[PDB]
Structure 1
Amino acid sequence: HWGYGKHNGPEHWHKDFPIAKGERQSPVDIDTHTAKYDPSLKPLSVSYDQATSLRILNNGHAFNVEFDDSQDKAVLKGGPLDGTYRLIQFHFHWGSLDGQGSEHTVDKKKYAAELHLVHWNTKYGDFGKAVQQPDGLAVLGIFLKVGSAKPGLQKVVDVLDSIKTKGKSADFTNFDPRGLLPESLDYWTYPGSLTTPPLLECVTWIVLKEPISVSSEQVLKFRKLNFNGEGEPEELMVDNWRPAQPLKNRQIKASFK
């Protein structure tokens, strides 16, 4: 019974999942001065025109916006990737305060939140099989800073009161994830892992350099969510970020100079 507390948080996970101390764990600090610009990198193709959102779920550690991944409707290709990656869900990680919440850091800077768009490699046929492979997933990571409102986020924010507690879901159709992307697709990339148990080392991370801006009011609404189930004592869903892990023998590549 893992979580983010003193007694069951990141620092304990290794007892259940020894891979926590592995060679390609995420997140990491992105040292912008040491990331090397890579000309091998093919351009990033995000093709979200046909995306079909289905549902939003409070899974007890975050909320997930789920997509129909039964066809190539919302796909990521190019960049560091070989082949086609289908969108399955997005989620966020966030803090109790505006000064923390992101998982990746940039020259040690923590953002207020981080958006993760999770995609699986179609050559493996389904998500469950893909997470067993070193190239199974591609996660597009976007930092959130507090400032102006993000209009394309509001639809997510307003349904959160209907999924307050663990296990609640709501229909969430017709949501366009393009409205959560910054202007530029410049990125850093490196090989890593999921950042919750089971911590599988199956992710090619693609972290965008340009943050999106959300309002204070928008982030506040994330912090009203609950880790607990209905009828259990209230524990606010905040600080659901794993801290930076050792880079070990990895290189972070930049798509830009």
Structure 2
Amino acid sequence: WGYDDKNGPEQWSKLYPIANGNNQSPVDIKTSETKHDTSLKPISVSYNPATAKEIINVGHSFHVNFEDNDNRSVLKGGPFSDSYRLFQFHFHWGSTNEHGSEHTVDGVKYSAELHVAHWNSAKYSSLAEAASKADGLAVIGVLMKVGEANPKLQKVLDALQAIKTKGKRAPFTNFDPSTLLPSSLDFWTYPGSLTHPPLYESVTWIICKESISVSSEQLAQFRSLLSNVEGDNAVPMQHNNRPTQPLKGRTVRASF
């Protein structure tokens, strides 16, 4: 599976029939069709920078993984009774600045999207068990609008030179990803899925109303990462964004 013509999001249903399910992500948030929900608490993030572990080139993208053995790094509040434990963050981006986000707002595409992924450690023992469960994952999505260089991205961008090719990894320590989140934590939420295979309908999405910035040059650094293993012909990671999927009667709630 991948993002190419031959293995891309249009082909995914062949290997993963859930691709055409009823709770697929991402979606276009229509602001006129959302519903202010009264019982949504604010989002509380409390991350410990010592839980940052490793940055990895996975060939379609790159992941920053966290230690998830205890509750040092948690997401609380919003639509949740339970505490969710941080395990990874990553980005999606497009061929050019014109597209790149997975979620769209009133049909407007942003240049990139930040995902912060968490698992339900109140109800399940591991990521392995939580990952396939209706209530198992919580991902925060932040839309990234092309403009001014984002200095909080610097430590991430500075690490990419050590994981240029597929399978390469390095230590990535002493990092609190709440520093990447926008000042306002006003959000939308809907029940949904992983935006790539295995596409489990296990995700409660938290989509920030406020965007963060990224430069054209910072997006060039993402696209300068390589999908091939060391010594093969260089294949740039041009894009890794899935097109928006039908709501199929689901309701997007707003905190605001």
Fold match by TM threshold 0.5: yes
Q: Which residue of 1 aligns with 2:142?
A: 142
Secondary structure of the residue aligned to 2:218 is helix
Task: Give, as a single letter, the amino acid of the residue that structure 2 aligns with 1:186.
Answer: D
Task: Kindly provide the CA deviation profile for residues 54-93 of structure 1, in whole angstroms up to 9, marking residues without a partner as x.
Answer: 1100111111011111111111011011201000000000
Q: CA deviation at 1:121?
A: 0.2
Verify: 1:116 aligned to 2:115, yes or no.
yes
Task: Verify the 8 A CA contact 2:49 2:175 in the aligned structure 1.
Answer: no
Cross-structure match for 2:221:
221
C-alpha contact 2:223 2:239 (8 A) present in aligned 1: no
Contact 1:50 1:73 (8 Å CA) reproduced:
no
The aligned counterpart of 2:12 is 13
Quote the offset at 1:51 in angstroms: 5.0
Taking the aligned partners of 1:50 and 1:236, their CA distance within structure 2 comes to: 30
Deviates further, 42-51 or 146-155: 42-51
Go from structure 1 to structure 2 and tell me whether the alpha carbon gap of 1:82 and 1:51 turns closer, same or farther (over 3 Å shift).
farther
Report the Cα distance in structure 2 between the residues aligned to 1:100 and 1:139, rounded to whole angstroms: 21
Helix, strand or coil for the counterpart of 1:219?
helix
| Offset at residue 142 of structure 1 (A) | 0.5
Paired position in structure 2 for 1:59: 58
Taking the aligned partners of 1:32 and 1:92, their CA distance within structure 2 comes to: 24
Query: Which residue number corresponds to residue 95 of structure 2?
Result: 96
1:33-48 aligned within 5 A: 33-48=32-47
1:200 matched to 2:185? The reply is no
| 2:13 aligned counterpart, secondary structure | helix
Q: Take 2:49 and 2:214, find their aligned partners in 1: how far apart are those partners? A: 25
Q: Displaced runs of 4+ in structure 1, greater than 4 A?
A: none
How many Å separate the matches in 1 of 2:191 and 2:82?
A: 16
Counterpart secondary structure, 1:161: helix
User: When the two structures are superposed, what TM-score results if normalisation uses the length of structure 2?
Assistant: 0.97
CA shift, 1:232, in A, is 2.1
**Unpaired runs of at least 5, structure 2:** none
Most deviating of 227-236 and 242-251: 227-236
- 2:82 corresponds to: 83
**CA pair 40-51 structure 1, distance change in 2 beyond 3 A:** farther
Amino acid in the other structure paired with 2:142: I
Q: CA separation in 1, counterparts of 2:247 and 2:230?
A: 39
Contact 1:51 1:74 in 2 (8 A): no
SS at match of 1:11: coil
Which of 192-201 and 223-232 deviates more?
223-232
Contact 1:153 1:179 in 2 (8 A): no
Q: Which residue of 2 aligns with 1:132?
A: 132
Give the structure 2 partner of residue 70 of structure 1.
Answer: 69
CA distance in 2, matches of 1:12, 1:169: 29
Deviation at 1:50, TM superposition (A): 5.2
Indicate conservation of the 8 Å contact 1:27/1:243, yes or no: yes
Question: Which residue does the alignment assign to 1:177?
Answer: 177
CA–CA distance in 2 between the matches of 1:155 and 1:218? 12
- Structure 1 range deviating more: 16-25 or 228-237: 228-237
Q: Supply the RMSD in Å over aligned alpha carbons.
A: 1.0
Counterpart amino acid of 2:231? G
Deviations 1:102-132 (A, max 9, x none): 0000111111100000000002111010012
Tell me, what secondary structure is at the counterpart of 2:11? helix
Deviation at 1:239, TM superposition (A): 1.5
Hey, what's the Cα distance between the residues in 1 that align with 2:140 and 2:224?
25
Identity %: 61
CA distance in 2, matches of 1:231, 1:244: 35
